[PDB]
């Protein structure tokens, strides 16, 4: 149960790579499955991984190109040792992609210089057979096939991250009960959403619209991303339930920000996502308060923390910042629990409750 400090849009951990160890800042990404680090100087990073300096690095004589929602890179594939001391084990041998070409991947302002893909082998490039970082860890250290994340940046404006627990769960990082939802497909961390509620009133959309293509838990995505129809439905319900008379289109699109001591949080409704329980006859709900989706950017200006997607419903960081999230791969489930670290000024930013019967919803909401 290795507990690694996190720092923080994106949460990154300090990683020692190579022999002698080189220290790099690596983004934790549960929406991809490649370990990749900068391998050449770049304008927007302060350090990179130099293969020449590591005695243990071994090239595997080929390149790979990975593409994301936004941004992409190309890197040489090899293997080196990542130093995570524990017991008689100094480091672990992992696959690593050393980036030499990239576009809109390293951006001005980012604090990381690598990415740690913690999703399933299915998403790994060039193929599923390129062993994941976490699978390397599990097989070499024989730790449980489980990891959990505590993100504590709720309220931090965009201009101490939390904790990444490798091999299990840390009771100190959450309070109350853990609610587990099944993993429908092992590529992303795809879960089944059954219902969305805003200000206590349910969206009357078919539950398959929340799962059209996929609903996933991705720490590498900042905002809550919703399929267009879901997004339009959410925006309409938020505007109605809000105490604010009118909204500019730019606010919803993120083109504009609202500037205000006093918070706009008490003028917006709560948003709840119902998730099927391991007991298929029940559901639980995770609820985000305005503190999470009305986000401070700097007198403060706030942005709408929800954005439209075409393909997927991405449970991004702005939702995960309200809970302790457990990626239980060994039991094919994702766990959620209340997080004391998520509070702002002693006030909660999220709720979690259950159980709720699923008698009134279809047996499978994933089309």
Curated annotation (Swiss-Prot):
Induction of synthesis: Up-regulated in primary breast and colon tumors and liver metastasis.
Modified how: Undergoes autoproteolytic cleavage.
GO cellular component terms listed in the entry, alphabetical order: endoplasmic reticulum; endosome; Golgi apparatus; melanosome membrane; membrane; plasma membrane; trans-Golgi network
Biological process (GO), any one: protein processing
Start and end residues of each Peptidase A1 domain: 11-337
Tissue distribution of the protein: Brain. Present in neurons within the hippocampus, frontal cortex and temporal cortex (at protein level). Expressed at low levels in most peripheral tissues and at higher levels in colon, kidney, pancreas, placenta, prostate, stomach and trachea. Expressed at low levels in the brain. Found in spinal cord, medulla oblongata, substantia nigra and locus coruleus. Expressed in the ductal epithelium of both normal and malignant prostate.
Glycan attachment sites: 89, 279
Keywords, ordered alphabetically: Aspartyl protease, Autocatalytic cleavage, Cell membrane, Disulfide bond, Endoplasmic reticulum, Endosome, Glycoprotein, Golgi apparatus, Hydrolase, Membrane, Protease, Signal, Transmembrane, Transmembrane helix, Zymogen
Annotated EC: 3.4.23.45
Catalytic activity: Broad endopeptidase specificity. Cleaves Glu-Val-Asn-Leu-|-Asp-Ala-Glu-Phe in the Swedish variant of Alzheimer's amyloid precursor protein
Protein role: Responsible for the proteolytic processing of the amyloid precursor protein (APP). Cleaves APP, between residues 690 and 691, leading to the generation and extracellular release of beta-cleaved soluble APP, and a corresponding cell-associated C-terminal fragment which is later released by gamma-secretase. It has also been shown that it can cleave APP between residues 671 and 672. Involved in the proteolytic shedding of PMEL at early stages of melanosome biogenesis.
Protein name listed in UniProt: Beta-secretase 2
Upper classification of the organism: Eukaryota, Metazoa, Chordata, Craniata, Vertebrata
